[PDB]
Amino acid sequence: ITDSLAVVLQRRDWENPGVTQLNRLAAHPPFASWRNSEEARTDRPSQQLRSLNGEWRFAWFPAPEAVPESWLECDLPEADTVVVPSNWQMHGYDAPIYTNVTYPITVNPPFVPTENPTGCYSLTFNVDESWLQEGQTRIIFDGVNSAFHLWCNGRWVGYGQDSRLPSEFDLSAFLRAGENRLAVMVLRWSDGSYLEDQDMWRMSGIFRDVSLLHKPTTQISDFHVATRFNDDFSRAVLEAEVQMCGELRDYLRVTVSLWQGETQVASGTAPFGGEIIDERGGYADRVTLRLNVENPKLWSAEIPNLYRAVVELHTADGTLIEAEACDVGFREVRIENGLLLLNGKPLLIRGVNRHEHHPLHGQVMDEQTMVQDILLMKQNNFNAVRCSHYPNHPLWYTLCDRYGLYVVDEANIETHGMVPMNRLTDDPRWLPAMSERVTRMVQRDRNHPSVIIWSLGNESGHGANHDALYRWIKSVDPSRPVQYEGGGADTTATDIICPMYARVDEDQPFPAVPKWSIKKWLSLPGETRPLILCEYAHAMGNSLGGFAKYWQAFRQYPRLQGGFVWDWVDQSLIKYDENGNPWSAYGGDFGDTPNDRQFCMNGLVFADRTPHPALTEAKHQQQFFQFRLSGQTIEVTSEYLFRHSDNELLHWMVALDGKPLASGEVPLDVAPQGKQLIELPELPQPESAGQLWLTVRVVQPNATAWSEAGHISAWQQWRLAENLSVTLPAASHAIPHLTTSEMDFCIELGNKRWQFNRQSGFLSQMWIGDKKQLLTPLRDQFTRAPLDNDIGVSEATRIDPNAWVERWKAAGHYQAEAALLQCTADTLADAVLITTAHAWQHQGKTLFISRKTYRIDGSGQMAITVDVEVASDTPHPARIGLNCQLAQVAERVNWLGLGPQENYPDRLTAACFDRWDLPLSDMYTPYVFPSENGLRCGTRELNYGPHQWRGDFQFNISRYSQQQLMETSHRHLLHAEEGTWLNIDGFHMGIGGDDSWSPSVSAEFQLSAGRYHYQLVWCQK
Amino acid sequence: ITDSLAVVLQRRDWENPGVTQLNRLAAHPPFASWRNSEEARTDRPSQQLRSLNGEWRFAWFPAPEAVPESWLECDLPEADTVVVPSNWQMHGYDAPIYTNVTYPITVNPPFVPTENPTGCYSLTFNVDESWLQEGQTRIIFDGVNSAFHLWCNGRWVGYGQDSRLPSEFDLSAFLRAGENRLAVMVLRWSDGSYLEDQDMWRMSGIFRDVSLLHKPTTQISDFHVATRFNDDFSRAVLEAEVQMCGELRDYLRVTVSLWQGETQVASGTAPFGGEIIDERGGYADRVTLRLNVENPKLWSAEIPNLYRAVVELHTADGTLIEAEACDVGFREVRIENGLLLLNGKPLLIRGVNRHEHHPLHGQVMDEQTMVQDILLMKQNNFNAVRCSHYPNHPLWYTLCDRYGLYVVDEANIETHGMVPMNRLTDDPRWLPAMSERVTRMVQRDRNHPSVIIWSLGNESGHGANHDALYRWIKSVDPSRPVQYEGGGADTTATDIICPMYARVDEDQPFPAVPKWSIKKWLSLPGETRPLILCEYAHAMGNSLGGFAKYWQAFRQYPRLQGGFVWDWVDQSLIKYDENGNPWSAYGGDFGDTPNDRQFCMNGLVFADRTPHPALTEAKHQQQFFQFRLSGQTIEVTSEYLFRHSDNELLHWMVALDGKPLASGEVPLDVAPQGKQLIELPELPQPESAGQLWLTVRVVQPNATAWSEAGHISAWQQWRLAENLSVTLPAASHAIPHLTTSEMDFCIELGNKRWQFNRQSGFLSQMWIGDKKQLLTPLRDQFTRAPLDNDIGVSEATRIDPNAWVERWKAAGHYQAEAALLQCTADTLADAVLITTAHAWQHQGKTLFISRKTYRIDGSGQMAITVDVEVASDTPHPARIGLNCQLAQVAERVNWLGLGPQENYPDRLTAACFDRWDLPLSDMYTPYVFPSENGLRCGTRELNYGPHQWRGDFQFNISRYSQQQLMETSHRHLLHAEEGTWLNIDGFHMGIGGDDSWSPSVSAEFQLSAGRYHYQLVWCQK
């Protein structure tokens, strides 16, 4: 009766931050209740721990109030059979909302909307009579979003908030032998939502596991581990504090044993009863053991040395009541003298922020996915990850512990959408709610070695609540530093200056919360903390420009210990078309309102875990070996702090314009922080013209746990020499004929013919034989289909006049009209010479001026020479080159320049100069939100079909015009055009990326010279 | 229905620390909602604020569950008419429990006993229709102990915990015009009780006021004041931050005006909208004004300069929506360089701890009582008070603000009875509950100038919860320091070393939490904070010995800035006898179990506010003027920091053995921290024998607000000279006759006769004429009826073998038997000489040996000469002297020695040497728990009836034998004995008092010499 919906729902606990839970057990590290020490030691599975994951019955309602009392007693006819865990939006019930800042619901704390999507889950299951004789049977939900009430066998059990941490209830007295039934009612919105405003899809449900754990009556209630070291780490102390619940009987003992493999390293036994703590005594229900470990193997992301710790609760006669365990990693984390140290050396964090996202499963995580992510990261030169912005699925820590990644664990607290940001975090009334989001995290994850820093949440301004919570942590677990960026990045609530999007060299001095240039921030008066960016280098779409600038500061300034790139995966979701064809969806694609569109796609990898090209630029910049070339000696520097180059080979090689002349291989013997000298054999040197390039690669000959054999971990290339070509071509056998007309000029020579339209001034067509080559005339191009960064936050509604695109738009770039100023043909001794001039103007303003000369010679080669003039007072153009639509469509593209991957000017350090050959398909980058892409810089020669262009340029080539790109919201809607679109740039502006909501292109990468010159040679084979 | 007891009670919110309140409004400074600025300015009364204090209907139940649903709807036949506020134990419902540490209920957090005394209060009242048109009508309870549920017009309103702070609910929508009814159900025990384990009577009910406040819809929700100063305090800034609730309309304004009297000093006006705080902006519902004040009058306990601040919320057209106000005191509090400063100078805290206690009303406070207390304190040289151990009744701060006392405001948190002490305070699950006890206190009291330090609670060990809360405060209100003694007195949670019962010179090194000698504590390595004792000098019963030692350190060591004596009033309660006669009751006197007996009586004043003699010793030691005598020049030093001696006269005077020879009066002109020189007139000097004494007194000629005219604020006395008596008496005219017998020796001379019993060796009787003088023989006395300090915590059950009494008991002191060793009479030329010797022994051990000579001469004077030998190995005796029971009973006592008040050896600095004459009645000190009392030291002559004794001794005289004292638990049970009991001590051991649970008598005051000598002269007039 008092179990009635009617009664229960009445209190509206989900509209009250003063009730965060009802009858929930305390937090603690992961338990299994093994009843045999070996299983515990070997991490075998505990029969005392049962999963309730699977098929559950579910029914959706628009408001908690629309639930029928019947539900409590019996299933529902119309209840569907759903799989758990899952996100009900993933099943169709309601839509997922992709909003960033702006809260999904209306801001009226602590109220929530009356229309509040309720999901009723139920499960019928069996409890074995043995579980009811003794012990305690409790239930666990690893993640319920956002809040929920619970009934068992028609009785009300409890309530819980906090989507990202476990809620546990003792079912001990509601359970009946055999058949039991659970009724779980999950509310989408609650007062907890006010604290969960992270930039991500807004979903709901029982999205993490459900389990049953059977514990003895007298049991281990919690335990913590700690490791102290001596000056040189040659000796450690493992300290374990154990607490128990139940009746304390003198025959009770505890044994803590430390294994390393099969080998027991240390063991300790004792009975309950701690040291005197105060005037009343000590804890009789606790015991602390201390094990001495000589020459412990240390844990690090470089070498994840782990031990196993077993905690046995037994009686003195040797009888085991129960056992728990955890992996142990010996490491010390400290900030000392402005530096963050790990095991005494200073880290350089090569990290990334990662959300729990699956395109198919929404926010439900699985082992496979976790592992994939981990390996990609490790393969790509990452050390660390930040749990943006809440505690993750438990297994995560374990994997990191094991594979080796540093983890920053973060409280599930984000109130980004309040005004001001502080509003709740400065309010004592939210102190409790917040408090639980921090404390429980710590109680749960504190024993993992991978966790090296605690974070108070994200973007919730800076309030007195943070200060308190930060102090709490420091008191409770001084083993790790605390960080929080809110309120300016350097408040009293953080041990590290941890801004987001601070530029390297430029300051952004917003009122109250400026973002100084990182190099400058450190030397502000009185400042002494280390600086590590919590988010930097916004990887949204065609991005990552300038990435290297960061890497270089990091390397030059000690107190700049790296940062976390934003972010790992694109938060795109899968949708299906008219023919059961899938496609990547984003903000607002689910009729979701209000929404932030593409803003959910900032990953380095696509939702399927396939990489964006940016990923390489990272990989290379973050590489652990560094090179310098001096004469014919290569100096190698190791950035490893703990390990020796012991699975590393260096391959070297010399080549002249793509042609290999020499190769070597040399095994690296460099210690962490060491140098290795490498002298090269006498290097060949040819008479032939061209550039000679040295390229080196570090290879991992043997496979590791996260890499295959032959994995390349680093590389670098240098230009060694140049033999300039002092050779004049063979005087043409033939001579081209010029046929004039009033419409055009024709040039014929051989089967070849070229036509220039005298009215437009462009080369309108060309034939090889009877076949035409163009579909579109060759013409000047000064624009580009806007990248995400060019656009920023500019919308049709709300225009951002500062966004590059807006400027360009406003100035007429996109709609300027050419103007023939001149077009002449002249006959040279051995060639024809065409000469043109256009002016591009908009509203009587001449933006640019293009002046060319085409010169066709007996060789049947045309040489284009171009010279642009850009008005000082017009926004600098995105680019400067030509384009045209070719008639042909070939299978491959071959070029001699940077590649193989897409590379832009402020994003090309990872690319190598060489001869690349790839399929056309590979020259297009499927950024879900179409834009200019696929560029390759420093090209010297490009070959497509019978064409060959030569010079110094950047280019791109696909089946999509710039216009089509520019006009398609999703990549799935693009259609291949008639032939091949070719864009050949003499120059291209950088892509930026410091952030994606303001101009981020550094000046060095802006086409601001005024005068631009370039030349090409088009010809055939 | 869901309003039903049945439903409500179901959740058992009082057995859950996760629910501290339900539907309670936020905390804030005191509001009145004046609707006229002048009333506000002048503190007139607000018609918008109505008291519901008075006659209420009440009914008591043994368990919440025994309440009848009817109650919600209608009064109860048997409900009585009680007055509110009150403590129901004060009315008879149940008993008050006097327990210290040990919790009243059984320790099973968060559970409470099923038998849980519920008090149902109800009130029928009228609401004026106007209040319901608009605005908000809310209710306030200033104190409900311990927890409660609330209904209005049969509807459930909310719940609340925290006995010592206000709970407010919006009744706006439950109210009906005209007749309304409240039903309040108050639970004695709740999960809140675990946090309220203060050493005091355990009571319950609606013990502070009940009010109704009507506010506008658009109102002032909170406001704070702050004052900054310049280097020399010649200029200040008053800063007021105001927040409002309701709809924000551009025509809204705020005006803050500062008055000094009638004179407006400054005013400021502005509209809502603060400065940018973070990335989202500012508070639109707040405004901060800053007023400049030139040469502000500063507030201090010496001179409570106050201003009035008025906060008006109006529209721009000048229309007043509403006004609030508060008194403002300009003062700066800072710890700087190890010192605690007030307005730039370093305080010396002369303070005391005070509980809210009334012998009649239990824990209900009234203005009269508050005021009495204040004045007594100020009169007695106190500067400050500590709110042991919870927030006090609101008016308190106001009075302190006004009369001038420094206040330490303390959170209502004491978990003394847990094991260990830390148990809850270290538990994250109690963090929220604790949090509210701190935060609300601050939000409420933060604007009072008298509050200069915040305290986190008392005796709750040291947990991570404290650290967080301490940081919170520092963040929120950096204007004051925070202190907390738990866990060792010098933790990271306190800005001041604030121990309790630390001795001056001796260390008490308990494990974990030692108590170093205060002088030593300061120089412990790394230590730099100031030290102020939160409790020192346990004033239980006959106490305060050694008080001066403290005063002297305080004066010599800068970093020793004083302390808080423990405590102000005796927590005794009034009971009535068989004839409606009242008497002072204590622990366990209400059949209360378990209990701490007298432990509740440690005040300096009795519950009726009549002083214990200790009070003087304080007054004198804490005096603000200090003297030194050099020749005939008196040097006066002022300890005032801010004020000039401007109501001070110095009276001086010289006297020879009680006889006045000279007097002066001199006006003091000494500045704070200054010296004044005073040269005395040529001082007379007589030939006559005797001691010449100089005595000076400082007088307050004019009355102040807390003192009458002619109040004496200080004094000091010196001995100037001594003219020794070289005069031999006039050779006796007569000669005494000795008549022997086998039973005794008789001496006759004149009407006078003396008889010494030859079997016992004592003077058994004496006659003047036909009248006998003794009822009991004159005999040696080595014991005393144990003071509270002699006993300590020793009980009959649990004996404390270290307690003085125990030692004495065990050694046979109390039951030793005399032994005539010798008894002889001899005839001298002009006198008779008796000579005796006894041995006191117990179990064949001779404890002491007494050797006398009585010598009676022609003058009819007996001279007693005594010489004791004390065994090295026996506990030192409490005293050494004689006693006897006189037959007479006279009305007065006159003596020449220290007085006039009771004075002991380690407690006599406040006493003066002179001739005192008082009524017998005044020679007895009515300590509720009878013990040795009334002593007066340094006596040279004592007169009672026809007797006169002369020498150097300490003595006491009443109608109660030591034995009677020793055997009566309460003073009300003592009965006057046949005549007058006289105790004349050659020597007396000190009383101690550093604490009352371990030996506190300093060695200098212990009778440890072995050999003791003394002489008397008994005679008549």
Ligand SMILES: [Mg+2]
């Ligand atoms: Mg809630």
Ligand SMILES: [Mg+2]
């Ligand atoms: Mg955000």
Ligand SMILES: [Mg+2]
């Ligand atoms: Mg509660």
Ligand SMILES: [Mg+2]
């Ligand atoms: Mg206590």
